[PDB]
Write an enzyme that holds these catalytic residues in place. Structure first.
Site, PDB file in Angstrom:
ATOM      1  N   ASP B   7       0.827  -1.187   0.000  1.00  0.00           N
ATOM      2  CA  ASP B   7       0.000   0.000   0.000  1.00  0.00           C
ATOM      3  C   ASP B   7       0.877   1.259   0.000  1.00  0.00           C
ATOM      4  OD1 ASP B   7      -2.400   1.573   0.397  1.00  0.00           O
ATOM      5  OD2 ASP B   7      -1.779   1.749   2.484  1.00  0.00           O
ATOM      6  N   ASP B   9      -0.402   5.123   0.841  1.00  0.00           N
ATOM      7  CA  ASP B   9      -0.777   6.042   1.928  1.00  0.00           C
ATOM      8  C   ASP B   9      -0.947   5.322   3.271  1.00  0.00           C
ATOM      9  OD1 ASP B   9      -1.158   7.496  -0.506  1.00  0.00           O
ATOM     10  OD2 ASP B   9      -2.975   8.433   0.254  1.00  0.00           O
ATOM     11  N   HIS B  93     -10.909   5.507  -8.420  1.00  0.00           N
ATOM     12  CA  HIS B  93     -12.359   5.637  -8.322  1.00  0.00           C
ATOM     13  C   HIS B  93     -12.829   6.022  -6.932  1.00  0.00           C
ATOM     14  CE1 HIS B  93     -11.907   2.925 -11.929  1.00  0.00           C
ATOM     15  NE2 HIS B  93     -12.585   3.952 -12.411  1.00  0.00           N
ATOM     16  N   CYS B 101     -11.875  -2.321  -9.677  1.00  0.00           N
ATOM     17  CA  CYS B 101     -10.448  -2.267  -9.314  1.00  0.00           C
ATOM     18  C   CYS B 101     -10.114  -1.779  -7.901  1.00  0.00           C
ATOM     19  CB  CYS B 101      -9.624  -1.487 -10.359  1.00  0.00           C
ATOM     20  SG  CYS B 101     -10.361   0.051 -11.009  1.00  0.00           S
ATOM     21  N   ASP B 125      -1.782  -0.708   5.860  1.00  0.00           N
ATOM     22  CA  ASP B 125      -2.160  -0.273   7.206  1.00  0.00           C
ATOM     23  C   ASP B 125      -3.629  -0.488   7.556  1.00  0.00           C
ATOM     24  OD1 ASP B 125      -2.427   1.967   5.268  1.00  0.00           O
ATOM     25  OD2 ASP B 125      -3.082   3.112   7.005  1.00  0.00           O
TER      26      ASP B 125
HETATM   27 BR   LIG Z   1      -5.940   1.734  -0.021  1.00  0.00          BR
HETATM   28 MG   LIG Z   2      -3.185   2.820   3.512  1.00  0.00          MG
HETATM   29 NA    NA Z   3      -5.351   8.156   0.557  1.00  0.00          NA
HETATM   30 ZN   LIG Z   4     -11.291   1.433  -9.372  1.00  0.00          ZN
END
Ligand SMILES: [Br-]
Ligand SMILES: [Mg+2]
Ligand code: NA
Ligand SMILES: [Zn+2]
Ligand SMILES: [Br-]
Ligand SMILES: [Br-]
Ligand SMILES: [Br-]
Ligand SMILES: [Br-]
Ligand SMILES: [Br-]
Ligand SMILES: [Br-]
Ligand SMILES: [Mg+2]
Ligand SMILES: [Zn+2]
EC number: 3.1.3.15
Lengths: 156, 160
Positions: B7, B9, B93, B101, B125
């Site tokens: 991931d 963020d 999205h 997705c 996270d």
């Molecule tokens: Br995410």
């Molecule tokens: Mg995250």
């Molecule tokens: Na974010």
């Molecule tokens: Zn998507």
């Protein structure tokens, strides 16, 4: 006694743009600088940044324009475990003929350390002259020919 | 091949608690030790794939240009330091879009489903990341800056 590396900023730690990193989009790290500085720290070197920032705090280079990219660069280093004992800056124009502009040694007077095992690392002739003036070794950083992996290997 | 699906963020970089989007350079902050630890994981043979929901990216709510500055800098830092992501997989999205997705759906990683499932992991996270792992039939590691941080992950996934 302490081994030091006195390291230039622009063209050494980060890429050298008008020669001013005055926008975030001008910030770019030099290859391998993080893993190699980590390696150098583990080998017992303390790190000190030393930089001439021509006209820092003027119309041509406001302090705010410098601060954003600089502070971000520092965040990045610190979060990855790279620590600089001091960040030494000369903000003057060459025409000012000040006391602190590299290769003059004023900013580093306090250090004037294990001289036999301390280095200035920078990409300009003036960085090498600073080393001569301090009575320590100089490494002329070059991204292609004398770069971070090479320095890391050499000094460990 | 062993893969780490990671991931962005809240995992590689901090996630802003206001709007959860890094749309300014003053909102960009690397998580502690991510660079040396990803380098360690790479040296142990892991390939890296970034996988992220960026809600509304490319629209007025999160302009492409606003995402691009901090994201391209982040990528420049990774690349220049030797961290290579095989792919960066992005769902732009909104939740209301009901797209194919959006994590924890697996559409973005369909090609990988190809890999050593016993030694591959999702690292993120959120519960969404752990659910992605389950949907992929692989292990999930819930990144937390204190309780399962980058150094711990680096050690855990290189244990012999
Ligand atoms: Br995410
Ligand atoms: Mg995250
Ligand atoms: Na974010
Ligand atoms: Zn998507
Ligand atoms: Br390197
Ligand atoms: Br300089
Ligand atoms: Br800092
Ligand atoms: Br915020
Ligand atoms: Br670390
Ligand atoms: Br876990
Ligand atoms: Mg320089
Ligand atoms: Zn000066």
């Amino acid at each position: 006694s302490q081994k030091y590396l006195f390291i230039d900023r622009d063209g050494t730690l980060i890429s050298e743009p008008d020669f001013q990193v005055d926008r975030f989009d001008k910030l770019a790290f030099e290859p391998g600088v993080i893993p190699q500085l980590l390696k150098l720290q583990k080998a017992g070197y303390k790190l000190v940044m030393i930089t001439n920032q021509d006209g820092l705090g003027t119309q041509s280079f406001p302090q705010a324009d410098f601060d954003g990219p600089h502070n971000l660069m520092m965040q990045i280093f610190t979060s990855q475990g790279v620590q600089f004992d001091e960040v030494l800056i000369c903000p003057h124009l060459p025409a000012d003929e000040c006391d602190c502009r590299k290769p003059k040694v004023k900013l580093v007077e306090r250090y004037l350390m294990d001289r036999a095992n301390s280095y200035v690392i920078g990409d300009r002739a003036t960085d090498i002259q600073l080393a001569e003036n301090m009575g320590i070794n100089g490494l002329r950083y070059d991204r292609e020919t004398l770069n971070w992996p090479m320095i890391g290997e050499q000094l460990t």
